[PDB]
Design an enzyme around this catalytic site. Structure first.
Site, PDB file in Angstrom:
ATOM      1  N   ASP A 197     -61.957  20.518  20.244  1.00 16.70           N
ATOM      2  CA  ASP A 197     -61.210  21.969  21.064  1.00 16.70           C
ATOM      3  C   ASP A 197     -60.468  23.368  19.812  1.00 16.70           C
ATOM      4  OD1 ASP A 197     -58.852  23.114  22.153  1.00 16.70           O
ATOM      5  OD2 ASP A 197     -56.734  21.796  21.607  1.00 16.70           O
TER       6      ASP A 197
ATOM      7  N   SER B 252     -62.892  41.025  23.119  1.00 17.37           N
ATOM      8  CA  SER B 252     -64.354  41.760  24.512  1.00 17.37           C
ATOM      9  C   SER B 252     -64.102  43.012  24.410  1.00 17.37           C
ATOM     10  CB  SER B 252     -64.864  40.769  25.783  1.00 17.37           C
ATOM     11  OG  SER B 252     -65.132  41.144  26.134  1.00 17.37           O
TER      12      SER B 252
END
Ligand SMILES: O=C(CNCc1ccccc1)Nc1scc(-c2ccccc2)c1C(=O)NCc1ccccc1
Length: 330
Positions: free
Chosen positions: A35, A199
């Site tokens: 994770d 992004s």
């Protein structure tokens, strides 16, 4: 040193991925959810309330000759689904594909919430976010990666998750045969303890690429791709009959639909998520309404590039002095 281990989807929808981990002496192998959105290595154990164990494999520290109780240490965590777990802490030997850390904090669960009990396939989590998020009190503990990193040939690990198929976690090296083209590296902020990056934009199917900064985290422990409501609406608008359902808790679409791809930007590079990756199947058994794999982050407070996005790429978690993230097509 290096390590490599295969990671396998827990079910037919890729709801999560499990990777075998050896703990203790002699080894006890548990299947952990690696994770990158959290920083605790915690496990179902012989100390877990019996009623809260349902098929998971448990760590029994009393059977490990290298286990040592970390005096006075406890841990407690909660996740976004309202799920939680807590317990005490041992140090023990932990290995992933033979890559071995001695003295690793292994957080033994005394209690877990229902969602964990109900998932027999996940024996615990292995956190790979930054150690600042580790919950052990009164003395915070280090992640497996932080403990291993100095010994590694290079201070990196990579995630290569498969769509409906196994994939690979590598520690300490870049497998240059595992991707196509080049790896584009992008800046990371560690201020919130995550692999947080920006992004450069998105496209829906064959549509026009939209240049827009989208801050979010690379999170192998989250199933879906959570993005701003405008972006998510733009995607589902291209799927006839798709709509956000308050009762279901997100976008659903007719199971008969063909889903368009979704592209996200990493610098000037583009990662294309095939449409099929975005189908999470009937909302309930036998339903012809299907659950979408791209959902709004509006109620989360942060965008999450979860498995839906990450599995379309070869992803480098570069833990150099100034960490960065790398993405390549594959
Ligand atoms: O917590 C994580 C990474 N760990 C995910 C995980 C793995 C196994 C079991 C349970 C959880 N990432 C982050 S960062 C921020 C959130 C969040 C999500 C929803 C609301 C508020 C915060 C989450 C998270 O909980 N991810 C998993 C998730 C669960 C339910 C709904 C969406 C996402």
């Amino acid at each position: 040193s290096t390590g490599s281990a295969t990671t396998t989807p827990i079910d037919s929808l890729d709801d999560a991925y499990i990777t075998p981990v050896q703990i203790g002496t002699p080894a006890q192998t548990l299947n952990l959810d690696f994770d990158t959105g959290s920083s605790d290595l915690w496990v179902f154990s012989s100390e877990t309330t019996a009623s809260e164990v349902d098929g998971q494999t448990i760590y029994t520290p009393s059977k490990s000759t290298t286990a040592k109780l970390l005096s006075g240490a406890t841990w407690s965590i909660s996740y976004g689904d309202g799920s939680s777990s807590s317990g005490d802490v041992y140090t023990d030997t932990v290995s992933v594909g033979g890559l071995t850390v001695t003295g690793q904090a292994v957080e033994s669960a005394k209690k877990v919430s229902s969602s964990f009990t109900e998932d027999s396939t996940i024996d615990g989590l292995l956190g790979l976010a930054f150690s600042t998020l580790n919950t052990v009190s009164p003395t915070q503990q280090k992640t497996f990666f932080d403990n291993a990193k100095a010994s590694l040939d290079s201070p990196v690990f990579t995630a290569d998750l498969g769509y409906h198929a196994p994939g690979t976690y590598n520690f300490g090296f870049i497998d240059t045969t595992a991707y196509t083209g080049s790896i584009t590296y992008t800046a990371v902020s560690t201020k919130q303890g995550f692999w947080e990056w920006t992004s450069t934009g998105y496209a829906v199917g064959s549509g026009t690429f939209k240049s827009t900064s989208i801050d979010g985290i690379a999170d192998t422990g989250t199933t879906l791709l959570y993005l701003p409501a405008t972006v998510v609406s733009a995607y589902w608008a291209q799927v006839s009959g798709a709509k956000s359902s308050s009762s279901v808790g997100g976008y659903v679409f007719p199971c008969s639909a063909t889903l368009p791809s979704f592209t996200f930007g990493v610098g000037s590079a583009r990662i294309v998520i095939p449409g099929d990756y975005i189908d999470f199947g009937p909302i309930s058994t036998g339903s012809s309404s299907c659950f979408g794999g791209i959902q709004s982050s509006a109620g989360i407070g942060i965008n999450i590039f979860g498995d839906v996005a990450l599995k379309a790429a070869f992803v480098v978690f570069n833990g150099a002095t100034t960490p960065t993230l790398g993405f390549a097509s594959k």
